[PDB]
Amino acid sequence: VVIRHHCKPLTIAQQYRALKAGGPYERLRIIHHDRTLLWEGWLQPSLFSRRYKVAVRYSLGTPPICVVTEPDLFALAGTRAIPHLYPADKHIPGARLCLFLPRSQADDGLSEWRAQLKISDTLIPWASLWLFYFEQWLHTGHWEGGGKHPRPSEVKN
Amino acid sequence: TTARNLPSGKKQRIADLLSQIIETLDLTKTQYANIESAYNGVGTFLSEGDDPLLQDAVIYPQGSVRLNTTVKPKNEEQYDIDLICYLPHATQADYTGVISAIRQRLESHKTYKTLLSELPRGFRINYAGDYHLDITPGRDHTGTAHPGQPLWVVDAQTAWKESNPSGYAEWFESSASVQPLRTILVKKLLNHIVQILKRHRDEWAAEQDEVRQRCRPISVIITTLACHAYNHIIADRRAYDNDLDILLDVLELMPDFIVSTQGAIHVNNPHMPEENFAEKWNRSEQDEGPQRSEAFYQWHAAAQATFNTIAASVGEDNLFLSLEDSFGKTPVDVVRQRLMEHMQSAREQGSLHLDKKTGGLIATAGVPKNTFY
Ligand SMILES: Nc1nc2c(ncn2[C@@H]2O[C@H](COP(=O)(O)OP(=O)(O)OP(=O)(O)O)[C@@H](O)[C@H]2O)c(=O)[nH]1
């Protein structure tokens, strides 16, 4: 999107007030001396699918981290390798999820996640969109949907 | 988990999947026009016969093609149509003269020689991988007072049995147009609930043994019993919020409305009570009559038990695992592949929204495109 550059990256408080307008939340803390936002809740993809718990951590200058905490995802993965995963976190357990093409792979300079957009509009429908392709990875053995480029050498990190 | 303790949204979503499978698996109207022009061509080739028994021969349809309850069979590319030719000058004649007359009248045409295989209820003009045509020669019955259609048919055993197709069909076409009462929520219905019970019957025969493969229930004794169960629901004037409890209550009254009287099972016609549609049920050589009363009720138990297995599944991968065993492997894959070519089109068009309180994505607040990597 051709947008103006007058809008700046916005602080903790504006997405602190924005997360309470949508959905049921268990707790929403602020830790590490007014640095790190934390959200967890119950997210369901469809009417007949499972029950999921996601976890959102944000710091300025860093991309946000989505990680599914319950269930463990490796027992229902069936001990085969799950693609579209980042290297995992050392502080909270679970499988980390990918949601965006970052800044270094884009050509216009604007990433798929931007700092102008708030948190609850985009990344939790993208987490539900990751989970809606996660259980249709099963019953066919393929990842039908969005896919990455077949890069010969690049690690995307 | 039972299918009556579910909410209405999951129940009518299951019934929408069943009606989507039946609307896939039926016969389309362009093929109906080709079948209609084809059998009217067979009827005009009968009407130019030089034999006097063949004169004034007219063909009207019968079976499932009159009631719009035709379903593509299991492992079969080709449908089946059945017809009756009525001959008023063959009332004096015997069945061998009319069988040789219809056989010579389709022996005159050479494409009807190269497209023919015989069958005991009548001659079958099968085609190359599209459909079949059947016919049945019949007289008229004289000396009885009826609301409609007095007729005998040709049977291979007793040489003239009886039927009454069009009054029974107009009894179905008068009961089918009546819609029941619906509560206030804060192709007809009887034509569709016959058809999903026929589709459940083919995948029921994929697991049963070879003695129950002969003893699977025949399709016209399922047709007349749900017509009996639909007349009682209209006469009771009850109301229904859902469209799956019109399938479950009709299957519940399905064993109570088959009436055995003086030791012989009678599922008759309302217009002509002489001939028995459950005469196949009634014969007791090698205890076969108890075998088709046992194997109808085993299918009656397993068409309620598998409706609790769809309600017991969690996960969308296990919804299509359970519905694979209801419809076969192939037709659930067409409905599933349509469901995320609509969902991949919803990301580009922006129609996909997500309410945060319910949590679930709804595909008809726009999500950005190209989310994965
Ligand atoms: N026994 C018997 N069954 C009938 C008669 N008329 C229609 N049917 C049944 O109608 C049922 C369902 O309709 P279809 O499956 O379309 O019938 P069909 O496959 O076209 O039957 P055919 O053309 O004879 O092969 C079948 O099970 C037939 O046996 C009849 O006069 N006697």
Q: What is the dihedral of CA A72, A78, A82, A87, to 10 degrees?
A: 40
Task: State the Cα–Cα distance between residues A80 and A68, nearest whole angstrom.
Answer: 18
* Residue B358 in contact with partner chain A when CB distance is under 8 A: yes
Task: State the Cα–Cα distance between residues B62 and B136, nearest whole angstrom.
Answer: 10
Task: State the Cα–Cα distance between residues B15 and B247, nearest whole angstrom.
Answer: 9
Find, among A124, A148, A130, the residue nearest to A64 by Cα.
A124
Task: State the Cα–Cα distance between residues B195 and B189, nearest whole angstrom.
Answer: 10
Task: State the Cα–Cα distance between residues B247 and B4, nearest whole angstrom.
Answer: 12
The tokens of A132 are what? 């809606």
Find, among B260, B268, B263, B238, the residue nearest to B250 by Cα.
B238
Backbone Cα Rg of chain A: 17
Whose structure tokens read 């004649």?
B93
The tokens of B117 are what? 């295989």
Is A84's CB within 8 Å of B373's CB?
Answer: yes
Contact B168, B150 (CB under 8 A): no
Contacts of residue B340, defined as CB under 8 A and 6 or more positions apart, other chains included, come to A136, A144, A145
Q: Is the CB of B68 under 6 A from ligand 1?
A: no
Residue A120, Cβ neighbours under 10 Å: how many?
19
Same-domain pairing of B40 and B135: yes
Find, among B144, B130, B279, B297, the residue nearest to B212 by Cα.
B297
Is B317's CB within 8 Å of A138's CB?
Answer: yes
Same-domain pairing of B39 and B125: yes
**One-letter identity of residue B316:** E
User: What is the distance of C-alpha B12 from the center of its chain?
Assistant: 21
- Count of alpha carbons within 13 Å of B244, Cβ hemisphere only? 23
- B191, with CB counted inside 10 A (0-12, 13-18, 19+), is middle
Question: Which residue minimizes the CA distance to atom 2 of ligand 1?
Answer: B220
Asked whether residue B345 is domain-assigned, the answer is: no
Residue B38, Cβ neighbours under 10 Å: how many?
16
**Looking at B270, B291, B312, which one is the last position of a domain?**
B312
Is A145's CB within 8 Å of B340's CB?
Answer: yes
Residues in B touching A124 (Cβ below 8 Å) = 354, 356
Asked whether residue B346 is domain-assigned, the answer is: no
Q: Please report which helix (H) or strand (E) contains residue B353, including its range.
A: strand B352-354
Cα B231 to Cα B195, B237, B303, B356: the distances in Å are 18, 10, 22, 46
Contact B271, B148 (CB under 8 A): yes
Same-domain pairing of B35 and B158: yes
Contacts of residue B329, defined as CB under 8 A and 6 or more positions apart, other chains included, come to none
Q: What is the domain extent for residue B51?
A: 29-166
Residues in A touching B321 (Cβ below 8 Å) = 139
Q: What is the DSSP letter of B144?
A: -
Find, among B152, B130, B131, the residue nearest to B141 by Cα.
B152
Expressed in Å, this structure's resolution amounts to 3.4
* Residue A145 in contact with partner chain B when CB distance is under 8 A: yes
List the single residue in A43, A129, A145 with the smallest CB-CB distance to B367. A129
- What technique solved it? cryo-EM
Question: Which residue minimizes the CA distance to atom 5 of ligand 1?
Answer: B63
- Domain ranges for chain A, please list them: 12-134
Whose structure tokens read 């021969």?
B57
Instruction: Find the residue in B nearest to A50 (Cα).
Output: B315
* Residue B348 in contact with partner chain A when CB distance is under 8 A: no
Instruction: Find the residue in B nearest to A49 (Cα).
Output: B315
**One-letter identity of residue B22:** I
Q: What is the DSSP letter of A36?
A: E
Pairing mode of beta strands B82-86, B137-138: parallel
Question: At residue B344, what are phi and psi to the nearest 5 degrees?
Answer: -70, -30
**Number of domains into which chain B is organized:** 2
Asked whether residue B335 is domain-assigned, the answer is: no
Instruction: For residue B50, give the 3-state DSSP assignment.
Output: coil
Give the gap in angstroms from C-alpha B186 to the nearest C-alpha of chain A: 19
Whose structure tokens read 């429908």?
A125
Instruction: Find the residue in B nearest to A106 (Cα).
Output: B373
**Looking at B125, B147, B166, which one is the last position of a domain?**
B166
Find, among B287, B251, B282, the residue nearest to B266 by Cα.
B282
The tokens of B286 are what? 């090698």
Q: What is the DSSP letter of A157?
A: -
Task: State the Cα–Cα distance between residues B122 and B293, nearest whole angstrom.
Answer: 29
Interhelix angle B189-204/B219-236, rounded to 10 degrees, is 140
Contacts of residue B205, defined as CB under 8 A and 6 or more positions apart, other chains included, come to B74, B212, B213, B216
Asked whether residue B61 is domain-assigned, the answer is: yes
The tokens of B20 are what? 């989507």
Pick from B119, B136, B219, B282 the residue to mutate for probing ligand 1's pocket: most ligand atoms within 8 Å of its CB: B219
Asked whether residue B207 is domain-assigned, the answer is: yes
Question: At residue B109, what are phi and psi to the nearest 5 degrees?
Answer: -100, 130
Contact A35, A61 (CB under 8 A): no
Asked whether residue B209 is domain-assigned, the answer is: yes
Residues in A touching B356 (Cβ below 8 Å) = 22-23, 120, 124
The tokens of B265 are what? 């099972």
User: Which residues 59-88 of B are in CB contact (within 8 Å) with A?
Assistant: none
Same-domain pairing of B156 and B213: no
Is B361's CB within 8 Å of A120's CB?
Answer: no
CATH number at residue B114: 3.30.460
Same-domain pairing of B305 and B229: yes
**One-letter identity of residue B117:** S
User: Which residues 7-36 of B are in CB contact (within 8 Å) with A?
Assistant: 9-10, 13
User: What is the distance of C-alpha A98 from the center of its chain?
Assistant: 6
Task: State the Cα–Cα distance between residues B77 and B279, nearest whole angstrom.
Answer: 31
Burial A13-24 (b: 16+ CB within 10 A, else e): eebeeebeeebe
Alpha carbon of B140 to ligand 1 centroid (Å): 21
Same-domain pairing of B142 and B269: no
Cα B3 to Cα A47, B246, B303: the distances in Å are 15, 13, 12
Is A101's CB within 8 Å of B373's CB?
Answer: yes
Task: State the Cα–Cα distance between residues A112 and B368, nearest whole angstrom.
Answer: 8
Longest dimension (CA), chain B: 82
Task: State the Cα–Cα distance between residues B228 and B224, nearest whole angstrom.
Answer: 6
**Looking at B271, B288, B312, which one is the last position of a domain?**
B312
Residues in B touching A141 (Cβ below 8 Å) = none
Q: Please report which helix (H) or strand (E) contains residue A99, including its range.
A: none
Interhelix angle B8-25/B329-339, rounded to 10 degrees, is 110
Same-domain pairing of B282 and B237: yes
Cα B226 to Cα B178, B348, B353: the distances in Å are 14, 46, 41
Task: State the Cα–Cα distance between residues B13 and B2, nearest whole angstrom.
Answer: 16
Task: State the Cα–Cα distance between residues B63 and B44, nearest whole angstrom.
Answer: 21
Alpha carbon of B27 to ligand 1 centroid (Å): 16
Q: What is the DSSP letter of B341?
A: H
- Count of alpha carbons within 13 Å of B349, Cβ hemisphere only? 10
What is the side-by-side order of every strand in the sheet holding A65-70? A25-31, A36-43, A52-58, A65-70, A95-97
Asked whether residue B328 is domain-assigned, the answer is: no
Asked whether residue B247 is domain-assigned, the answer is: yes
Task: State the Cα–Cα distance between residues A129 and B367, nearest whole angstrom.
Answer: 10
Sign, CA torsion B26/B29/B33/B34? negative
